Design a protein around this ligand. Structure first.
Ligand SMILES: COc1ccc(NC(C)=O)cc1
Ligand SMILES: [Cl-]
Ligand code: NA
Lengths: 301, 301
């Protein structure tokens, strides 16, 4: 038993991380087979921050302008192209530590592990969720661009995030590994701000199911709710709408615990109204929304 | 910026994990050089676990009684001995993936990364503190025994923990890699309880500094205090005593923020008295005590 924010073992990703330098800018890249993926903003200088014309900046680059380093080894770049907001440096060596992998774009609410990296060297691993406003609440300092997010279901590494930038509110924005931003953001230093964030209701519910699995029952009640009444209440606390999809997804946890989804919704409505009254759930005094239904089942009995 | 509970990258340890089977029990082992380390209780049947005589049960065993599997490869066990509550299985092959490592014993209040494993296969990684009561608040299911905890210093893995058991309250107990328990526990199926735990004061303070560094500043104030006055409040709230050594260790963070420790203690005092019923610091409505000064500095530098 116990319940923790648990990251995937990072080794398979660690063997892919390299340092990319262009001009005076160094950041991280992801070396898979004979390609290194990194943020295209590596090719920007000081006066290319606001309105970079990436197609124009890149045509002016030769292969030798990019210094790629895997530990001590210099990798030799033999080709470059851009795909959306990701730069793809072709190298002369295929990475012998390339794992089984895929690229997947995730939806708000999904969780993944982040391997924070500086100068091509992994620093730490932690779990994030894609927030409803398409940001993530990470821990990123200067030099962390090109750090990636991933899952590892069944020995295959699914890459879903590459870190590009920190927005003014101290939250983080990035792309999938096809270079498409999550959310309305752009890789320019023009003023940008995240939308108002909301709580990931389906995840909070899954976490309440975790709590019950782990032997907590204090927050349950004898009430139920219609789905609609639930949404009308929860939205007043900036919770995301709960959809029939979400209800379907919780069916297994419902079944294992014997607590119908809408009954659990009733408990959540009450927790929102009352707070915790000095109590905690799974070691938190807040309602946690960064565990998916799938994370709960993975981690629990 | 941002502040997240972060594990060490786990790859150096993942390469060391194997499966160990003795009779009907399978659990995890740590393969370093030509030895596999696992809990001695692997040699126990359920009957045995009530009152085990390990000396006796072990002489009755032979090398072939232990099946050790690294991935899809059987290792040949060529020797077996016990050190305290750890079994040492000598095998015919040195682990080619052995990292630079040492075995260390950590102190209460210190943190480490746990690589949770099942059937020799790494499953997840998360950070834990060794509690004052010598338990850890982990996340472990049956099969997780022999999972290890570690820190990384430069390229040296310091192994400090091996998982042995869950206590009735849902908290976890284990040994160092030399088989010495953390805490007053024994490796037998008997009645055992964690002592009442206390809050790690210096870590709470470290985390208040992290909060300040990330622009969470509301809880600050003009006041200061003394060690003596504060400690009398700490005792009252089941906080560990704050020592001069703790104040010194927080020196960097006092410097960085302009808030002196006793200055921060004044803040913490008010928080213990006055509370935070539902209000938040770094996204928590609890006073978090599982980040050390080093954790805060390392993450925030
Ligand atoms: C299957 O038989 C056993 C024997 C021993 C344990 N555990 C401890 C701590 O003695 C568990 C199961
Ligand atoms: Cl998704
Ligand atoms: Na103060």
């Amino acid at each position: 038993s116990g319940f923790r924010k648990m990251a995937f073992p990072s080794g398979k990703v660690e063997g892919c991380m390299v340092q990319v330098t262009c001009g005076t800018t160094t950041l991280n890249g992801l070396w898979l087979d004979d390609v290194v993926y990194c943020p295209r903003h590596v090719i920007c200088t000081s006066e290319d921050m606001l309105n970079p014309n990436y197609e124009d900046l890149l045509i002016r680059k030769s292969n030798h302008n990019f210094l790629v380093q895997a530990g001590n080894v210099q990798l030799r770049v033999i080709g470059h192209s851009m795909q959306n907001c990701v730069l793809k440096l072709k190298v002369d060596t295929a990475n012998p530590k390339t794992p089984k992998y895929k690229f997947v774009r995730i939806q708000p609410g999904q969780t993944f592990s982040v391997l924070a990296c500086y100068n091509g060297s992994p620093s730490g691993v932690y779990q994030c969720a894609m927030r409803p406003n398409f940001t993530i609440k990470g821990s990123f300092l200067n030099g962390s661009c090109g750090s990636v997010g991933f899952n590892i279901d069944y020995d295959c590494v699914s890459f879903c995030y590459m870190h590009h930038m920190e927005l003014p509110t101290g939250v983080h924005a990035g792309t999938d590994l096809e270079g498409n931003f999550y959310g309305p953001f752009v890789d320019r230093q023009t003023a940008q701000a995240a939308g108002t964030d909301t709580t990931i209701t389906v995840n909070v519910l899954a976490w309440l199911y975790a709590a019950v699995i782990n032997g907590d029952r204090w927050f349950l009640n004898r009430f139920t709710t219609t789905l609609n009444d639930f949404n009308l209440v929860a939205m007043k606390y900036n919770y995301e709408p709960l959809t029939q999809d979400h209800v379907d997804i919780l069916g297994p946890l419902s079944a294992q615990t014997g607590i119908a989804v809408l009954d659990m919704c009733a408990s959540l409505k009450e927790l929102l109204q009352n707070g915790m009254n000095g109590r905690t759930i799974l070691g938190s005094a807040l309602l946690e929304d960064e565990f998916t239904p799938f994370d709960v089942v993975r981690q629990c009995s």
